[PDB]
Amino acid sequence: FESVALIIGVTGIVGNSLAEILPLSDTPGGPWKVYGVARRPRPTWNADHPIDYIQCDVSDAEDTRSKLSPLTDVTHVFYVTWTNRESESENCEANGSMLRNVLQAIIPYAPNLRHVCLQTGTKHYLGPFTNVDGPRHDPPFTEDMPRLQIQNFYYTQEDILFEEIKKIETVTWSIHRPNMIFGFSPYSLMNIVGTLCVYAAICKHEGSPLLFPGSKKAWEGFMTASDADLIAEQQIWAAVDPYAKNEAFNCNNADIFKWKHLWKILAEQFGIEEYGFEEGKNLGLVEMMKGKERVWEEMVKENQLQEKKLEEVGVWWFADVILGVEGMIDSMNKSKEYGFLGFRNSNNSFISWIDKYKAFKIVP
Amino acid sequence: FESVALIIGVTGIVGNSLAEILPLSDTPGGPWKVYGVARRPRPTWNADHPIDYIQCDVSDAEDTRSKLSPLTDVTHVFYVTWTNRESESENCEANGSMLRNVLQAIIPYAPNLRHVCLQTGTKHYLGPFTNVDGPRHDPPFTEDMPRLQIQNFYYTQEDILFEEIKKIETVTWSIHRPNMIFGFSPYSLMNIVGTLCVYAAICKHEGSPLLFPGSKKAWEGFMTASDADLIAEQQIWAAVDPYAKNEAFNCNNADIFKWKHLWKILAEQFGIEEYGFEEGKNLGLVEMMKGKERVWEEMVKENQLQEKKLEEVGVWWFADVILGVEGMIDSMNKSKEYGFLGFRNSNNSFISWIDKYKAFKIVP
Ligand SMILES: NC(=O)c1ccc[n+]([C@@H]2O[C@H](COP(=O)([O-])OP(=O)(O)OC[C@H]3O[C@@H](n4cnc5c(N)ncnc54)[C@H](OP(=O)(O)O)[C@@H]3O)[C@@H](O)[C@H]2O)c1
Ligand SMILES: NC(=O)c1ccc[n+]([C@@H]2O[C@H](COP(=O)([O-])OP(=O)(O)OC[C@H]3O[C@@H](n4cnc5c(N)ncnc54)[C@H](OP(=O)(O)O)[C@@H]3O)[C@@H](O)[C@H]2O)c1
Ligand SMILES: [Cl-]
């Protein structure tokens, strides 16, 4: 092995992309050995990746010392996880400590450690979702925009990363700020493609129209997204190319789309002939999907689906956040200037990830 | 000489870029010999380029036969000109004939002719500026969008391009569709940077505020632009690349901006401390610059500017068209998918072209 990866959050929407991409023969920095961490037992859809899967709760400092410190051959860390707490100060404490626990478990014990990738996101520029009327930057967001003077666990984490890495001489860092992620992970806490697939599958089953749940402004406005494989590609790029060291990078597909346009594609992928925006019917998925447990059960049994629990893959609250906003776009100029020229056509990305939820039998 | 270029419109906003870039030692397809065509005598700001400048009116078939047919070593044509007539039907006749005259003068007499680049633009997707109520495509525009069923001299020109080149099996073509062009050419009929530079220069000289002339929607909206050097780069790419043959491509900087943002930059480059948007003061540059000949004359004498005629470089009508729209953006996915990964950071592009208008003494 040339490099040895430790993925924190390996069943996540990016973690699962990293787990599949890192071991490939043509992957830069390769051949790679991969450790993957998460709490739950390894799910079947994650199981084919040739990694060493380690159950570890990184919020538990004892557990991380016990399970991570023995991984002495680690050369690169990819941190791609979070915990969703009910206040931002708790987010700061809990997510800061998860990252701190990982770093403090591995840095004194992995003498060949070279780099840490930290994934955050566009909330760097916007603040937490609750930041409704406070300060915020004006899109398109750029990495050199200053931090908002509002609490944000991304800032807490960055500070911890900087402080821990400063203590050692042999390690660099990179920060990666994706927008809404297009990817495959039933376990993900924020999953626009998976959740829209569940919604569309239900409409198809019911024979009811694919009605847009969100706002007129999100329907008509411009957005961008971040393909999970593309994110993995940029982290690997930063992990193996010295030119990218100690910098933060946005990471999105580098094109622009409207939900009106992707909606037609969604309907077409599911064979739904009736689709569109209808004001008054757009009530948000939390409300519109209330009471669908019975029909979901019917669909699972009829179609031999693999996740029986609707709320696991039907993550309505996040879809409702996404489909309520417009124009929250980030710039890819710094990435290109640094020589990262990865992109995705968002139409084709969307279609590709839709196919994965069908292929793994999450939806028909 | 590996290739021999014929630029039609060599003092234009893209022509001037092509003339500067083609002869460089590292330019693909090089070393290039370059012919450049325009009606007027070569202006001093065009004079540096090592090209053979030929005066020729390509609306005159006799003139094109007399002046172009002897250029028997031409391998590539770069067509970057137009004529602005009062009705679209006249636009179709006049611009169609200019292109046809060039093709018919060169194709029979240049045995090593290999390729023709035709520049059109985003109006392919929107129709002429007068098409305010007729049908239009929804942004982001893609090259495979079908032609609007409305008259458009771009369609006329494509048809002529296809017909003439069909007759000769050794020649390929490519079509390039820039958005608003950021570039340097005082002579250009449509020139957002040059014109805003003149406006800013006048405000600075007067000591008056840099007030936005256009709509609130344009101020707040997203737009994109096409760097003239980037356009030249794409035309050169298409001229030499085996994957680009017989295709149309959009060509913009690949990022997005808001005029609100560029306006601060414009102010800053001209050292204007008072700038912004004020409703009721946004009356369009045509109205706002009425009667500014006097102050321009003073500025010209004081700073020894090289263009004395205000309306040669203050092209208000086009700036007013531009600053009254938003969201008219084109996709660069096809270009990227074909292997053209050229881009510009539009902030830096804007700044660079502003400097050119200062360097060549067009504005202080
Ligand atoms: N998903 C998006 O659309 C998106 C968009 C922009 C930014 N981001 C940001 O990306 C970063 C990573 O989030 P993500 O979306 O990639 O996460 P994700 O898809 O929800 O995956 C989280 C991973 O981490 C594991 N995990 C959670 N808590 C853990 C713990 N205490 N110990 C060990 N493993 C744990 C999870 O599995 P277990 O539950 O089994 O432990 C899972 O494998 C976050 O900062 C997020 O805000 C995400
Ligand atoms: N400029 C923009 O912002 C923009 C944006 C999108 C698309 N486009 C499109 O780009 C294409 C080319 O336009 P452009 O803007 O690059 O042109 P341009 O900047 O206005 O330059 C026109 C060039 O052609 C010369 N010319 C004009 N008529 C001529 C004639 N009969 N014979 C020989 N030379 C002639 C001009 O010089 P002389 O007058 O001395 O002859 C000049 O060199 C057009 O279809 C345009 O609509 C332009
Ligand atoms: Cl985020």
Ligand SMILES: [Cl-]
């Ligand atoms: Cl145009």
